[PDB]
């Protein structure tokens, strides 16, 4: 053990941090009058409708 033959010192480190995420949203509010353009075999009604508003510059 003389002459620092067995003296030793070591250190080590390892680090990892990952993360992730996502999100989506949508809202819609209004009222629209549509018209029936087809009646299906079970009585369900296909409906289509369009509202066009022009206010000033569009």
């Amino acid at each position: 053990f003389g002459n620092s033959r067995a003296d030793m010192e070591a250190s080590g480190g390892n680090s990892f941090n990952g993360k992730g995420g996502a999100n989506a949203s949508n809202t819609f509010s209004g009222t629209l009058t549509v018209t029936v353009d087809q009646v299906l075999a079970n009585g369900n009604l296909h409906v289509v409708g369009e509202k066009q508003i022009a206010i000033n510059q569009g």
Binding site: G12, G18, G21, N23, G30
Partner: protein, 58 residues
């Protein structure tokens, strides 16, 4: 002669040229938003401050 006119029925437009009051009340509002993120951090280290003799060559 203006033809037959119902007595107790509410006054409705029935023929071409009849007038009707439209109360314009429109309130439409739609919105959508989304986001995504991802992160990754990595750190690694190793150090031999004092190396014993039998480990020196390595």
């Amino acid at each position: 002669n203006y033809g037959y006119q119902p007595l107790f029925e509410d006054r409705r437009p029935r023929n071409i040229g009849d007038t009707l009051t439209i109360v314009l009340q429109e309130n439409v509002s739609a919105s959508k938003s989304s986001s995504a993120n991802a992160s990754r951090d990595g750190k690694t280290s190793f150090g031999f401050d004092t190396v014993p003799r039998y480990l020196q060559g390595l």
